[PDB]
Symmetry: D2
Subunit: 279 residues, 4 copies
């Protein structure tokens, strides 16, 4: 493939790492749970015993993913259609979650939109679409669930999937960077504010996950792209009771990409042994 | 005043620090320029020779401030009504800026809204108001001006006023923290993306600037006092001046040491007395 | 107890979370592995199948811990005396590690010293002691093992235990903050430089691990446990984390986000006061 | 030569603060005989300060002191000091107080560095860099601080680190480590020593004028290297009474280099207009 030689030292493990009943009796709510990383996280949660609820705009995709997962694990996966931009729809969706499965013990905000563009080509509407979906949508889901958990006197573990470029900034993905950085600040804020209510909040910042990646592999110390299964192991750990004292954490899941990118002299990896020998 | 004793070591200097006419021939655009921090920055820019344009919702406040500043400095201050939440109004405001003063050399995004609230008492409308004004408003201003500068083949220095709690998060100001963190990521992105177009972007993160929180805040500020708007204006004018032409993508805490004090796990041991330390030894 | 009411929502799970053979065939090297967090990490590694080598200054403590762990798990734990301040002793310790167990797959730099003091009461010797143990000691171990792994074309996962105050700074623990921040920069540097040699490097930043004043600043309402730390550490050193490199993970019950937020002290405002403020 | 956009970011080399901004003040600068230290000393002296410069080479220090004082008319004293030696640092601080006075301004700039694969570092090479940069800055800062506490006087401290202290970087790993330690030290003392009137700030430079340098320019949004005069303007501002409420701050002085390096998609600057149109 396109992987670099050092990838032999960093082979992925794709199987769930936690014990087979680690989420028995637990309820999990995953936005964007019908596709991609959301589907992978839902799959692992369901495999480990959770009753899952997935929500996004496309009910056909959600129902297909829900049947696929539940057929494989024997545990229920419920689909609820929801555009997270619509705070009234979010409110109804949370009420439905509580009715069909119960208050959630695990909340994963993963719904996102993105497109790569020179910033000077962005329109105000394109800007507002990304910030509405990523930032406002995560806020509405988080606040609505939080209010219900406070009313019920129940706690939960929340996880938001952002990106390494939320904290650094990045050209060409500027609206996504901005909205995702807002999501990070939101979760750090609520980690500090809502401990008394039993809610903890963590962030995973992914690099590139397999799903122009030769150029990307050249900037990844581990020499390969990440996998959704590995991300799901990290996410399920953070959402599990084994991580009940992990709160306000921000975890890079990136093969070393961000430390590589950010270090001023890391490009000197291209200097050969022979060139170093020659001073 | 209510200041802590060590404030004697950190007295503020309120006069502009840069040379007279350091902004002669320059145009500056300041959102929120009619009040508070925005007015202080506009005052210093005008004093140093800039032609300024201030924009916000209240035209009477803007006109009053413009007349007040221009009558002291002798340099023109133009007022334009603009709700930064409305991208069409932002577009028209930038067109007027160029028509009445010219392309800006200095852009300061300072318009904001905020309130303190338990997050569980927030409504979607309150959430939207803060994020729309702070995050979307700054984006519309920055993108609209940037596109015009690219078309004119001119550069500029941009400055955004955020807060120390954008990077840390904070309970009780969570919408502001989120929106302001978005503004930080926006500016770091454009500093990296738009160098080829001659635009640089920097961030100031203020602590509290000059009723019970204020007293407790002083106890958490190493410099022993609140900041002043004049000091903030000195920092802002420096960063927007040609003396800072190689400062780009920078984030600068202006907080009297508040954030380092807050963030350090054992800083509360300031209360331990000399005699208690002798025992501990 | 001293725990806050909300701790009921965040009860610790003390059992090892990874599968029983997650470290079968692996060799781990743990500085400070005879006590405290190092002992807890070694215990979980050994329980999960690793062969472990623990190194620090006190050979009697190390031997007692080695016997305790290996008796319970059935897997070997080797003790080596090593003062990490001494690079020649570090070199000899790494040679012995390779002879008795083999090249390590897992390296945990945990040896440290600390004391609380006003910074104006520090002496040059006190400064040197903390920085030499924490920063230079971790550098010597990491450089010595890394050079051996490069020669052998074998990879490993490295973990350094720092602290939340490495990144923030903190008064009263200033030498420790400085040394530990140096350790963080070291590991981020090598995560980027040495991935090409199959080594990855991560950091855990702990809050307080088993006082009441501290608990009131922790959102989770209790101190952390060594078993929870060991679950996080073993995950990061396991092949399930083979794409986690250069990461810095707070393990602090929320303490650092609570401390660092300008308005977080408003947690003291009552419901009635908020009603009034509205 | 510089990149095409450099014409938009031209340097201003003249001191920006008022002519007497440091009249009556005393400044102590480690490494003040060369490079950035000499530039900072030059601006301080021009603005009225009485300066004391300290490093290992007394002949260089003497030459620089005469050169500066002959141009400004303000005294510059040379004191030989290897900052690795805490007893020599103690003696140097006592001489500073005797010949000039307690310092109002303290700039820790002495450093050593060399670029090397980390696997080519020796323990002695490691210890040399950490001793000079981290221990040397600690000894200077602590010894001066103790004297200022005894006299009930305050001061502004400034440490020159680097953008790679906070990020890490391969090939400069000991410098990254030691300089990160300096950052933590200064943030710690800003929080601890407010009651004593001492504030502490950090400048993180990118590449400053005086092979890799042409490649570096392509990674610098401002399109050129920085100048020592511009750095001296930033440093004199931070050490002046105009910045008396700036404390614990860390300021990048890097032409945008760090935000460029750190952003995941910034390399898409190479995509042409026609390629973007196609999309």
């Amino acid at each position: 493939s396109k992987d670099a030689p050092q990838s032999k030292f960093f082979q992925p493990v794709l199987k769930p790492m936690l014990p087979p009943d680690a989420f028995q009796g637990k309820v999990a709510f995953i936005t964007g749970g019908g596709t991609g990383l959301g589907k992978a996280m839902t799959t692992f949660l369901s495999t480990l015993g959770a009753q899952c609820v997935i929500a996004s705009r496309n009910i056909d995709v959600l129902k297909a993913t829900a049947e696929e997962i539940s057929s494989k694990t024997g545990n229920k996966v419920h689909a609820i259609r929801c555009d997270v931009r619509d705070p009234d729809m979010v409110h109804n969706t949370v009420l439905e979650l509580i009715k069909v499965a119960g208050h959630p013990d695990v909340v994963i905000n993963n719904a996102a939109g993105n497109f790569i563009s020179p910033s000077e080509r962005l329109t105000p509407n394109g800007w507002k679409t990304i910030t509405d979906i990523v930032l406002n949508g995560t806020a509405y889901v988080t606040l609505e669930i939080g209010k219900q958990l406070i009313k019920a006197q129940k706690g939960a573990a929340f996880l938001a999937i952002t990106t390494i470029y939320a904290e650094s900034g990045s050209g060409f993905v500027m609206p996504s960077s901005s909205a995702k950085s807002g999501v990070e600040a939101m979760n750090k804020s609520l980690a500090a504010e809502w401990g008394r209510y039993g809610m903890r909040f963590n962030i995973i910042q992914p690099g590139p996950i397999k799903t122009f990646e030769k150029e990307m592999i050249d900037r990844i110390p581990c020499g390969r792209l990440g996998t959704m299964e590995e991300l799901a192991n990290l996410a399920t750990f953070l959402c599990s009771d084994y991580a009940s004292w992990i709160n306000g954490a921000v975890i890079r899941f990136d093969g070393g990409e961000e430390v590589f990118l950010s270090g001023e002299f890391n490009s000197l990896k291209k200097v050969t042994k022979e060139e170093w020998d020659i001073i």
